[PDB]
Design a protein around this nucleic acid. Sequence first.
DNA 1: GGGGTTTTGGGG
DNA 2: GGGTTTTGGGG
DNA 3: GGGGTTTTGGGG
Lengths: 449, 215
Amino acid sequence: KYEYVELAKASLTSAQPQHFYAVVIDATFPYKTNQERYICSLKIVDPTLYLKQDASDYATLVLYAKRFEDLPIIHRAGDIIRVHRATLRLYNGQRQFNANVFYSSSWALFSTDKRSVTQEINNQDAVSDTTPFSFSSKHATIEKNEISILQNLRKWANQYFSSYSVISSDMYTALNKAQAQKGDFDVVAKILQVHELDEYTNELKLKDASGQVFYTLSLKLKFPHVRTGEVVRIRSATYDETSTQKKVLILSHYSNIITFIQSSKLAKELRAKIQDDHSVEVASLKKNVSLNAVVLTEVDKKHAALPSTSLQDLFHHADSDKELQAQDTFRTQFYVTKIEPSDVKEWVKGYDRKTKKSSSLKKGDNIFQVQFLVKDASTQLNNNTYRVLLYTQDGLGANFFNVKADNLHKNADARKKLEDSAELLTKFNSYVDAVVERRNGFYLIKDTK
Amino acid sequence: QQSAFKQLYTELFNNEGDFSKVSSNLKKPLKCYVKESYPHFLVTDGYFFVAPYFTKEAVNEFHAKFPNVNIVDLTDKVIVINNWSLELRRVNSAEVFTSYANLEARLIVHSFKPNLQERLNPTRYPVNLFRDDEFKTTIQHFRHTALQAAINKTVKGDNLVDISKVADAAGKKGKVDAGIVKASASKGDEFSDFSFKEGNTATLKIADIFVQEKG
DNA sequence: GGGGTTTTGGGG
DNA sequence: GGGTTTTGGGG
DNA sequence: GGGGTTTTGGGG
């Protein structure tokens, strides 16, 4: 049997093992310190300790282990952690709970929202509202009397996050002041874009309430929950004084990127107040070389939720993988290596609906018959380039160029805009976000501009 | 630009691996701090760390002008590289962490001297240059450029998918590999049509310098 | 047996 | 504990 | 002392 105590009422005198339920509002990533020690530090709250009178107040939790796997990975602020056998002491004025998981202490994470982060990523349902989505040791036991404790704390967690910022202004630094910091700092910003730099790395395009834009490398395995449009808290970042072409944030192995539970007032406000910036972009289009990635296209709103499929899967597995076979409409990203036909003037051909044939615009019903040679992160190293079509005779991709089809041999204005577009598309670091439809072994662009 | 290494390695890639085309005012002695000596010898410039590649002559010379001062124990001590060159090499990036996209910029060290003189310098935590956003991006530009030239030289004749194939596809099924096009005149499955001449230059395996000092 | 702990020799 | 491993692209 | 385990009483 376990007796759970509230954070503010935990004994500072009796250095005896105590147990508790708390809300996690911050945490480093589990990190190694030497050859046998791993550590994870977090900030916790509960109905008795949550607010200084205005900035948020909290206790600190320090978990020690001998294996990376014995520590909690905190992807989202707002979830609940249950700890068994922790010793409480005062560290520089703050209530600090210490727990050696490598000995007799244990922990278990409970989702405050319907699904845990991982469950949202994989689209799974939670076994039950009383099941820990993660815990140390081979087993975890929850008693009947615990249910009310957990259910109540959840309710409290939502009330707390919905009426308070939780991550108060004193807990992070405005991005346009980052360069003024002596060392590392924290940031709260919206993810404007997630660029797959390579096989193992994501590049986050961030922008906080100050309006400043920054980029930072985010490993896929470490932070698989990063999503465009979402607001995250970055625990420990440093200004990169060596990054010239763009503003870059440096993260360490202990750094952490954390999302917020649905009820978060702060996340809700930042999502709405912070709007997409393309300025850091715009300037590039005037440079011969852009170290900053540029996503040239935007997919139709109705697909914004559609998951993407790599070129590798699209061209090498689409005729073998069960899942890919049952789909005829995909979303993918890539960069154009070459556009065919070479002569931009021949991009628009005349089409004879009856004979299913096209001809040079020296004659026909006008349509685009462009063939892109593409490549992406998943195929970066191979000796291939892939064909993606923009055949609009049936309507698919008719407005891709924001130029209605026309005889490019006669309409100078149309030819010029398409020529410009061609230079942008084949320029280094230019990318395309598009939806495609599979027809007779080929992919056609649609609902993209 | 601030990071000597970042600038040096960036200029190398931005000049098709030709070390003679890189600024001359950058070919001055390199004063760097030793972050690690074994199992991986890594030196920093106050912002990044790179792996120096010593020539057999470089160590023999060192082992003479500096008797008993072991190299594999230089950790946390500064070294001054007086003679050095930069080469470009093809490697397996899944095995060599001091590289990216199967490409590596190597610092060939011919002569270096140790300064144990309580050498200091308050610095930020050094990071792998080949993990830096901008630098990775630089190497990507390099590859994109080579890839584009190869494709515009290998792909010709506007072999466009015949419109009928996709505009009357009710009773038509096809294989997606039909859309796969070779980007160059390669041998295997890896793109290798580059034009920089892969420098050779023999170097010592870090373990050999450890045996030559403590069998 | 062996960890981490202190129980510092001995439960279940 | 607001930190720094190597598993040297979770650590 | 108490886990997990097997050592089933007894080390460092």
